[PDB]
């Protein structure tokens, strides 16, 4: 459980400790640490540190437009379409690893993302027009 401890465990047990996975990835790699410094290792270190933040910030930009700036688990007001999966409540959470589930939505994973921005943020932050001051 020190890192990816529940990679093979159930999606429910993996959902119990998903903080750990998030903590190590951005921070990890110990990047922090003749006269030249133009060596082949330093240039592989810098670009490896650039995608470090540019893959982190690629994901953190998505949660910000979903109301999840500082939450590891948002429940979003987007209804689930039956075409994406036909399995019941306890059918997936007590049976599949997150690995199996990632390939089962990888086909229509982009369709979900586009709809998440519309109802949870594009409309929700607008619904306060009549409720902010009245």
């Amino acid at each position: 459980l020190g890192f990816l401890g529940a990679a093979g465990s159930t999606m429910g047990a993996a959902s119990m400790t998903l903080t750990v996975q998030a903590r190590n990835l951005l921070s990890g790699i110990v990047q922090q640490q003749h006269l030249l410094k133009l060596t082949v290792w330093g240039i592989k270190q810098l670009q490896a540190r650039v995608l470090a933040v540019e893959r982190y910030l690629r994901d953190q930009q998505l949660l910000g437009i979903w109301g999840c700036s500082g939450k590891l688990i948002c429940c979003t007001n987007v209804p689930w379409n039956s075409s994406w999966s036909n399995r019941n409540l306890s059918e997936i959470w007590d049976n599949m690893t997150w690995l199996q589930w990632d390939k089962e939505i990888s086909n229509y994973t982009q369709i979900i993302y586009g709809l998440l921005e519309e109802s949870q943020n594009q409309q929700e932050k607008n619904e306060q027009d009549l409720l902010a001051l009245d």
């Binding site: 998903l18 990835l25 949660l63 109301g67 999840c68 590891l72 429940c75 979003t76 409540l89 990632d102």
Partner: protein
């Protein structure tokens, strides 16, 4: 119905991909010796605490002959070799008509030449003659009094390696960048490449050293069981075969020549370090192998090849048929100078169907080299003044085809290490990096506030 979708940041899923890595080595030599050709002058130091986590219930499919970690390793060492040779003395005014004669053998094997030439001195106006020595095959005849020629001047340039550069391989960890992880296989019998059931997610690899060897790997890693056999393709005899030793055979190589550093200033500051007169007799270089310890290793290999290769055919172990003297002999850099010990003596044994003597091998030394068939630029190896000994563990073997035998029986694998990338595969057969995707959507009745 009435089920909502929910977002999860921190999910453990990944997809097979490869990106850039980096070096990791702790405090090794620094002051007592420095200017290493591999660890450069400074690399990212590894932490003494090993980053390891055992993965359970997971069975990710690795690949070794399609793994891109060996590809980045192959290309990293190449660009690293040239980076450590660009700021060193070039040897261009060393291509002048050489007039040599055979060494003093009491008017009676030869292998070396007491040669001379004239070069540039500190003043471009003046010239100077100096007598040095060279090795055979480093020079080939032109057309009385023998007049010779450096073999490289015919094809490519030349630049002497720096004298204070250490050519000893030290452990260089390859650790994954942020948002990625190197999966190592913990299953002992990892035949070929398939689904390894026992997986560990480690951030830094183990102490991997860039042993530049040929036919016979040295200082490799292994973790028990029968001597493992790995092949990209077992049915195709044409493909190369990597072999791993359940236990290493302690070998010793050395040259008995007692040489002397003869520095001669070419141009303003540069100095060409050549061989002087050899003091205290002349002898041939050799590598010893434990004869009793080798007969057990060739027996364990043929045993596990048996159930792999029909277990009915005849074993035919021969010398590396064909090839070049540098690609068929056990070529390796040790102690500064580059050895090429004669392999043909080891594989003479044939075993089929059911204080102590040690076999030795004749070896010669070469100073002009441009390894892995890189024809761009060659380098001269300064003779290391004094004594030389190698004494390394051998842990791997590289064996190649056995002709186009049409059915019938009778065949084995004679040694060939035509490719340098395969040498690094003996350490990276279990490693594969994956692109971690921390985003994962899943449904559950669950919604936040209605209006906000």
């Amino acid at each position: 119905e009435n089920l909502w979708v929910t977002v999860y940041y921190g999910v453990p899923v990944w997809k097979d991909a490869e990106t850039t890595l980096f070096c990791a080595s702790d405090a090794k030599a620094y002051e007592t010796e420095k200017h290493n050709v591999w660890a450069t002058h400074a690399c990212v130091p590894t932490d003494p605490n090993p980053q390891e986590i055992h993965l359970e219930n997971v069975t990710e499919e690795f690949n070794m002959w399609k793994n891109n970690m060996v590809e980045q390793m192959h290309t990293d060492i190449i660009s690293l070799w040239d980076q450590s040779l660009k700021p060193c003395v070039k040897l261009t005014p060393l291509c002048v008509t050489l007039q040599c004669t055979n060494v003093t053998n009491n008017i009676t094997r030869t292998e070396l030449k007491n040669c001379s030439f004239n070069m540039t001195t500190e003043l471009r106006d003046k010239k100077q003659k100096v007598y040095s020595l060279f090795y055979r095959l480093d020079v080939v005849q032109i057309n009385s009094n023998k007049e010779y020629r450096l073999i490289n001047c015919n094809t490519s340039a030349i630049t002497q390696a720096c004298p204070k550069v250490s050519f000893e391989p030290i452990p260089i960890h390859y650790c994954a960048p942020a948002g990625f992880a190197i999966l190592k296989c913990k299953d002992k019998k990892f035949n070929g490449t398939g689904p390894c059931p026992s997986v560990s997610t480690v951030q830094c690899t183990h102490g991997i050293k860039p042993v530049v060897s040929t036919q016979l790997l040295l200082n490799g890693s292994l973790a028990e069981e029968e001597v493992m056999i790995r092949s990209e393709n077992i049915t195709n005899n044409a493909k190369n075969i990597l072999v791993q030793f359940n236990t290493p055979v302690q070998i010793n190589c050395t040259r008995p020549n007692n040489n002397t550093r003869k520095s001669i200033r070419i141009g303003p500051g540069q100095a060409f370090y050549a061989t002087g007169d050899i003091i205290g007799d002349i002898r041939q270089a050799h590598c010893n192998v434990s004869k009793a310890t080798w007969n057990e290793t060739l027996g364990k290999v043929v045993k596990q090849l048996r159930k792999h290769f029909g277990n009915n055919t005849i074993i035919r172990f021969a010398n590396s048929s064909g090839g070049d003297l540098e690609v068929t002999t056990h070529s390796f850099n040790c102690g500064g100078e580059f050895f090429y010990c004669n392999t043909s003596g080891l594989f003479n044994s044939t075993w089929i169907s059911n204080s102590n003597d040690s076999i030795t091998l004749p070896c010669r030394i070469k100073q002009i080299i441009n390894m892995w068939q890189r024809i761009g630029q060659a380098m001269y190896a300064p003779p290391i003044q004094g004594v030389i000994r190698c004494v390394s563990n051998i842990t791997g073997l590289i064996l190649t085809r056995d002709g186009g035998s049409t059915n019938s029986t009778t065949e084995t694998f004679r040694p060939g290490g035509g490719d340098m990338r395969d040498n690094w595969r003996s350490e990276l057969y279990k490693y594969k990096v994956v692109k971690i995707e921390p985003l994962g959507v899943a449904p559950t009745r669950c919604k936040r506030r209605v209006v906000g």
